[PDB]
Design goal:
Keywords: Acetylation, Apoptosis, ATP-binding, Cytoplasm, Kinase, Nucleotide-binding, Nucleus, Phosphoprotein, Serine/threonine-protein kinase, Stress response, Transcription, Transcription regulation, Transferase, Ubl conjugation
GO molecular function, one term: mitogen-activated protein kinase p38 binding
Catalytic activity: L-seryl-[protein] + ATP = O-phospho-L-seryl-[protein] + ADP + H(+); L-threonyl-[protein] + ATP = O-phospho-L-threonyl-[protein] + ADP + H(+)
Enzyme class: transferase
Strand order of the largest sheet: 3-4-5-7-6
Bound molecules: the ligand O=C1NCc2nc(Sc3ccc(F)cc3F)c(C3=CCNCC3)cc2N1c1c(Cl)cccc1Cl
Protein name: Mitogen-activated protein kinase 14
Distance between the termini: 20 Å
CATH topology of the largest domain: Transferase(Phosphotransferase), domain 1
CATH class of the largest domain: Mainly Alpha
């Protein structure tokens, strides 16, 4: 008893969606696919619909698409993009070739805010609080974001925030080259493949983000990998003996020991005028050694979030089986799996 679809040439492609979705307008296209805004007559919500482009053109692609669908279907938290609906005009696995994803329309990312507004210390408390709240949830499911940036953070007029972008194709080296904001928020360990990274990489991103909202400027706006690494070490000091031994890459560790030793600066003199509690939290987040970096759970209990902290209202996620990450299958099988997920989907209770 499927809906009734209608075709329409939006942007370079022909979107075929259920009748419930009207007034679709372009929002942006890319290798990932195409995104449209629309009004969901069945719920009265304004939504954003994404049509995946060539989801099963390769094994690497069919797998990515399965990953993204699995991630989005799993997310059930207020500060994390939830999946309101997912459909395909296809009537059987044989026809199956298109995938459409539907989620809330927030309206603006975090870049807009920090540009056309003035953030009080109270605002920074609320915004970062929600990022950390959603992060405690994500990490509790052994899920790593890996790419937290202001553009991956959606906010509405009420200043409520939702973390976005999961299971997206990794950034090409060209995308990480030069004076680009796509690298400014990454932790040094992944930016230079120092070791096997983990969730602590997101905490570093939050640090970079929180600093920007407080000062209104990018924390480590490097013109390239090396220049960015220098800006970092300049603030947090050069690696100690303990951190060097953890750097698996003999090449990277080699380049590091060639840099003149520098002491960790004084955050109080760097972030002048900032809430002393903000400064302290920033020192707990921006720690070069990832093992000693504060966790999201620990940060939420930090005095800087007293006004908002609520130990009974910061839920964790259910188990997320991602054993498929090390499974070797053919396009067809990844595709069939994706299809099963689409049909087994269950709309949010509301
Ligand atoms: O407000 C929202 N809500 C959801 C959303 N999802 C996406 S992608 C996407 C993912 C899952 C899904 F079900 C549905 C989805 F659409 C993008 C995109 C990410 C990459 N670039 C293109 C769009 C932008 C938004 N914006 C948005 C933001 Cl944060 C700022 C300005 C305008 C909008 Cl519509």
């Amino acid at each position: 008893e499927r809906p009734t679809f209608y075709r329409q040439e939006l942007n370079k492609t022909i979107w075929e969606v259920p009748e419930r979705y009207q007034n679709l307008s372009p929002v942006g296209s890319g290798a990932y696919g195409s995104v449209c805004a629309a009004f969901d007559t069945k719920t009265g919500l304004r939504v954003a619909v994404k049509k995946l482009s060539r989801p099963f053109q390769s094994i690497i692609h069919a797998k990515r698409t399965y990953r993204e669908l699995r991630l989005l279907k799993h997310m059930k938290h207020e500060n994390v993009i939830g999946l309101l609906d997912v459909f395909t005009p296809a009537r059987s696995l044989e026809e199956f070739n298109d995938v459409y994803l539907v989620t809330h329309l927030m309206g603006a990312d975090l870049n807009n805010i920090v540009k056309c507004q003035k953030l009080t210390d109270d605002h920074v408390q609320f915004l970062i609080y929600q990022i950390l709240r959603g992060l405690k949830y994500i990490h509790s499911a052994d899920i790593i974001h890996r790419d937290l940036k202001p553009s991956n953070l959606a906010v509405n007029e009420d200043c409520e925030l939702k973390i976005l972008d999961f299971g997206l194709a990794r950034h090409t080296d060209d995308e990480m080259t030069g004076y680009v904001a796509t690298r400014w928020y990454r932790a040094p360990e992944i930016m230079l493949n120092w070791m096997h990274y983990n969730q602590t990489v997101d905490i570093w991103s939050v640090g970079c983000i929180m600093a920007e909202l407080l000062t209104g400027r990018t924390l480590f706006p490097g013109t390239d990998h090396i220049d960015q690494l220098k800006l970092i070490l300049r603030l947090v000091g050069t690696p100690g003996a303990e951190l060097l031994k953890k750097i698996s890459s003999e090449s990277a560790r080699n380049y590091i020991q060639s840099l003149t030793q520098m002491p960790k600066m004084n955050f109080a003199n760097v972030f002048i005028g900032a809430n002393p509690l903000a400064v302290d939290l920033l020192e707990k987040m921006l720690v070069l050694d990832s093992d000693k970096r504060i966790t999201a759970a620990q940060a939420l209990a930090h005095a800087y979030f007293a006004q908002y902290h609520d130990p009974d209202d910061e839920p964790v996620a259910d188990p997320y089986d991602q054993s498929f990450e090390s499974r070797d299958l053919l396009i067809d099988e990844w595709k069939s799996l994706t299809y099963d997920e689409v049909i087994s989907f269950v709309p949010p209770p509301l």
